[model samples]
Target chain A: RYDVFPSFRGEDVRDSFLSHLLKELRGKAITFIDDLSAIKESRIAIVIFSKNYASSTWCLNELVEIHKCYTNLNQMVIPIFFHVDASEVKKQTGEFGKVFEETEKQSWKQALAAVAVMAGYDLRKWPSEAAMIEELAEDVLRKTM
Target chain B: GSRRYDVFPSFRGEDVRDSFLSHLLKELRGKAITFIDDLLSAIKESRIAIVIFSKNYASSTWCLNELVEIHKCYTNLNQMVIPIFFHVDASEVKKQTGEFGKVFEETCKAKSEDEKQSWKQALAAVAVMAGYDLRKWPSEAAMIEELAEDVLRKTMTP
Candidate 1:
């Protein structure tokens, strides 16, 4: 089984913040799988909630699937609220509030609320990379094992 | 006839978009359409259909279809067609010989009986028109200028 799975919008932070986190996790002797198959098969998932997360239909779909896996399979879902407030995802407000016209469903909206209620990490700005790794990696390794 | 544009340009975009046809299209962007599937309606929409017969022209079904449709407009709507034979000889286009000959053979396997006849007729008709022979022109600048002037002259008349 994969130790941790990450679902994130590449344009948001793939080259910088996300990679920085992944690099730190690896150094901490934490394994990670970069595949969506981890979502259905009952493994820990890392959801990086960026400013543009809601705008992407793919990410919203992944979030919905991850939430379902969290509830039914008891797989750990670690929400990383990167550069956005977790409460904003709870109500689909701020940059997350855009209707995206016909593409959204109630399942993803409900998942957003439920996931926000759970304990999550908040990255307000680009501050404190070393601190982010030490805090997030330890929790991830503990829960995943 | 109801009109939507002054010109309908028929050419593969890749072959011309960066050069001679790019210059033509940039100047005529508002006045022209580069793509049209409804051949009958496009005939009514434009006063002239500018056909740039490049090396890879006949390989496309849409290109052959447009040539056929442009000729139909000439017969029915009294629309004019200005053919610019670029690099390739008009004789090859007329007779469907050389690289055009090979491409046409492949296309015949793909089109219907009536479509094949339409394509043949369109090619034969346009090749014989008193159109611009690109080889005769001195430079690309001279050629583009001549084509631009000819387009301007026809548009000015009516």
Candidate 2:
């Protein structure tokens, strides 16, 4: 029912990047799913990792499902490491580690590690965020088609 | 664990516990929404918070303290706060004027300036956000329906 599934901590991106990204991506007739089971029907999963991404169990549960979709259903998973380091997300260190350790979910760790390994965007590299958002929209367009 | 609860309500119990809150809780229950009316720990554990401001709300130091914590969670932790002006004016709470102000003044008489200022600031900040005004509604039933619907939308959409 949807073309893109997004898993994110709203405190991180809702005020800035997520809305802009949504604007660029919505230019086409694309369906967006913002929930869990909806992930199964989507073609791709876009996980935006922020400083407190691991702080919410809701986000981690989505990550675990995204990993499952990637493995079993061949659904494409695109990760956006926003503010947080890709290395930290992969290893569960730094701010990500602190939150992750608080309520250690073993399966969430695997999901985080798995998604971190996939080819994705490290937001820090992009000097012009506008350009990255445009490129990300284009990337989703290409994959969904 | 999945943000714990959907909504956490903060209100002065003596003022609205038997009237507004009882109905509101019933509405939330009918919608199958989980909520906690709590001290401070529950505020951090919830995804959304509703502050029901009544006549005696500012009079209670405990209620003012709860507002400060709710404001903290709203600002930093991204918990959405919905303020309901139940038989009380929102601006009166914000500016600390009229009966609400008089009560607020008496409540702060024995407290430190810092604590008083903190409560005032928290009240002013939260009052400005988009929320329900009970006076404008035709009936309590109608307002509770709309409030519950709005809460459901925010919790599900977020």
Candidate 3:
């Protein structure tokens, strides 16, 4: 079973500090799964950068699928804002809100909301990319082994 | 016969100063509350400091200096510092991180030598205080109105 799923929009942290941090996590052999199929039967731990999970259609769809099929799945969701403000996430709108504007996201808004409830975590406290990745690494490892 | 409460409203003069702050002062004036705009005057007579944090707040040395002074006075007087994050994030101002910190650095670099000394002093002082971020405050206008009323009542009762 896949231990942890690092779900993020590559565009959000493409060349940023989070990219560097993710590299470190991969080096640790903690099984950071970026592919959707790997999480099907696994007890997954999801690291969401922000409420903008719907920013990328692929990420949003993956989350919806995870909620639908994985009944025995034990998941931990970590939301990080990076440079985006936390208040924006709490309100579920702002620049980050733009990520949910696609047709796929519009269709699954309700599903996404339900998935958000299942995750039960706040991304605001993880202000910087480095701090966020460090926190995610700790949580993923703690859950896995 | 009793101690007078001094209130100071700090903001970016470019935004929300004339519009919102003016309205605030107009209402406070009716209550005969002594509101101090000058930091020197406020610090001398007041026990509590109310700061209004707006987007362009980092652009001003005057606002930052007053915050530093009030913080320094925390030990000697019954000085309480309250920060109102007006349509801006409180964490932005408190952490001196992100765009706010960048603006502060630029402002310091642009100042004249004589002004730079005092500006540095002020920045150093306010840098340490715990501040509130109001960017995502749900009811900002209502909260400001409530604060005005509370400040008036606190000062007038005794």
Candidate 4:
């Protein structure tokens, strides 16, 4: 039922980046989806990784599913982190041992490694929310086209 | 944790006035000084600040002011800061997202743009410091006991 699917923590980006990003998506008349099985018309996966990354079970399951959608379902997955350190996520000490069951996010090196492989935008110190959305919108539109 | 008092608790009443905080305060009872009427005085006197960040934390302006001052003390007043994200996450405070973002948006309507910026910065600053994540622990009893122990360790370290 939608053209795009986003898996986000729902707490870290609500009124800021997500709000602006949604506005941009709306401007483009892109339909967004919530239900995981409802990934019908999605041409792309927009994963918004915030500072709190994977705290919720919904986010935990959704991220795993989104990754599969991109890999196994032939849909494009634009995995990205917003306001979070990419390298840090990739390299945590226990460094070498962290699971998506997400037991050790404190030292979640593997999580970052997996996320880094996917081509996605990193929202570190953006100029403004509008500009950020504009850039992301263009990227999504360009890739989908 | 308190000098004039050992610990300064920066919290919103709606979230923790009756629960773990009551227990925490009871644990601290007679051991050290707690809230000294004036928050600034509390900051100046205490060695550590235990900020209980809950779902409704950002809704109160009074708590924000206390936090700003607590951070000021942390920066210049040589006090320690420990943020305990109750139901909320520390990242929400650092990024000022979710409920933190919600209240700030409301406050932005009433505040000058510059004052608003300071508030946001203060929120970001405190959240960065290493503290407890309640979600990581088992229960309220465990979180409070651990906090009291950690506060004692930091106080002694300082």
Off by over 4 Å in 3: A1-145, B1-5, B37-39, B110-133, B156-158
Q: What is the TM-score of chain B in candidate 4?
A: 0.88
Model 1 per-residue lDDT tens digits across residues A18-81: 8888988898777777535567764778889887877788888888889888888887888887
Put the candidates in lDDT order, highest first: 2, 1, 4, 3
Q: Choose the strongest candidate by DockQ.
A: 3
Whole-model lDDT, model 1: 0.74
Residue B75 displacement (Å), model 4: 1.1
Chain A superposition TM-score per model:
0.87, 0.94, 0.66, 0.77
TM-score of each: 0.47, 0.53, 0.43, 0.50
| Per-model fnat list | 0.00, 0.00, 0.00, 0.00
DockQ of each: 0.00, 0.02, 0.04, 0.02
Model 4 CA deviation exceeding 4 Å by range:
A1-145, B30-38
lDDT of 2 by residue, A1-145 (tens): 7889988899988879898888888885667954268889989899999888888888999999999999999999999978776777988977779877786378888999999867676554343568678778888998877
Measured by TM-score, how close is model 3 to the native structure? 0.43
Sliding window of 10 residues with minimal summed lDDT for model 2 chain B: B129-138
lDDT of 4 by residue, A6-98 (tens): 777777877667777888888987778633665535778787766565456666556566655656777777766576544445543232223
Docking class of 2: incorrect
- Compose the digit string of candidate 2's lDDT tens values, residues B22-137: 99999999998998744678789988889999999988888899899999998899989988888888889879999899999999999999999999999998876667777656
